[PDB]
Design a binder for this molecule. Structure first.
Ligand code: HEM
Ligand code: HEM
Ligand SMILES: [C-]#N
Ligand SMILES: [C-]#N
Lengths: 153, 152
């Protein structure tokens, strides 16, 4: 499923990050774009501006939205017994990502940027291999739920 | 061109790293595969092995070779006035990376993996935005030189 031990690691870390989600959501996306600058081109609101990424107001709104959706899905994973998303559905997410040509490589880059952002966000006391694994696995479940809706039938 | 200052930054860092190029070259490749595990499937000696990535004998040899080739290209960039690649040719590298299907996204990931590896190889004191930019720009010149030979 998603173990009680992993739920606890997710819950205590999200307890901290949820209070700085504006900043962390943006740092998450900046880190994606540092690793893969080509990814910038996929987002119309980036394609249509030249302001520093750090300054782009539509990026901030979008970034926090996605980061919050991701962390909320991880935080409810055990309680709900499945991936849940608020404000949208897995079918809509799958259709959108398919249309925008999001590939396995994009998901792998984003997984790493998320885990590097969470590592930078958390007290050194609570960072470790268990924490990294709990978040990576919750992310993996989320992506697999999206990919179901990007493949036939 | 490539400035005297950028050369100096590359030279004093490579002076440290060259003493540890085996370990560093593998660190560099493990970081590539950490970020993008699908890149593993590009390397036939990875696709066909039983053993963990970290222990693979062929990976170690390949990793040191690319790491050294990259750092020497950067170390020689100003002196030579252009990108050189040791024991080979830009035409051969281009042909090879074209044949194995290496794409712009692979070069982006690998750039980031190189810069993190180098950061972690250097005292926090030798690091900073100009050091990062010197290496990033040398890497960018190396990649542009290779890509020239992957296109008509
Ligand atoms: C678990 C991972 C992901 C989640 C939960 C997620 C979620 C979302 C959501 C909620 C939207 C719609 C936003 C809106 O209402 O406008 C969206 C749009 C989009 N996503 Fe993702 N996404 C994920 C991964 C990715 C990845 C890896 C990429 C590529 C690096 C990506 C590229 C896009 C693009 C190009 C759009 C269209 C942008 C737009 O709405 O104008 N997404 N994503
Ligand atoms: C600065 C960038 C790079 C340099 C200097 C470089 C250099 C090399 C060299 C020297 C070889 C050996 C060719 C031979 O033995 O004939 C090689 C092979 C190869 N490279 Fe790269 N490479 C670079 C980037 C990449 C990237 C970004 C990828 C993909 C993530 C990649 C994938 C491959 C593959 C699949 C091979 C063939 C594997 C094999 O030799 O069996 N390389 N590279
Ligand atoms: C997806 N943003
Ligand atoms: C090329 N490795």
């Amino acid at each position: 499923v998603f173990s009680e031990e992993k739920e606890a690691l997710v819950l205590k870390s999200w307890a901290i990050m949820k209070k700085d989600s504006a900043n962390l959501g943006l740092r998450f996306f900046l880190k994606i774009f540092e690793i893969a600058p080509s990814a910038r081109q996929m987002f119309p609101f980036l394609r249509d501006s030249d302001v520093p990424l750090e300054t782009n107001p539509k990026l901030k709104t979008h970034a926090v939205s996605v980061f919050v959706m991701t962390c909320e899905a991880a935080a409810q994973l055990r309680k709900a017994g499945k991936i849940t998303v608020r404000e949208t559905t897995l079918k809509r997410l799958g259709g959108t990502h398919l249309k925008y040509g999001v590939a396995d490589g994009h998901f792998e880059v984003t997984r790493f940027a998320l885990l590097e952002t969470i590592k930078e966000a958390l007290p050194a006391d609570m960072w470790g291999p268990e924490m990294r694994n709990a978040w990576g696995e919750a992310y993996d479940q989320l992506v697999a739920a999206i990919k179901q809706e990007m493949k036939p039938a």
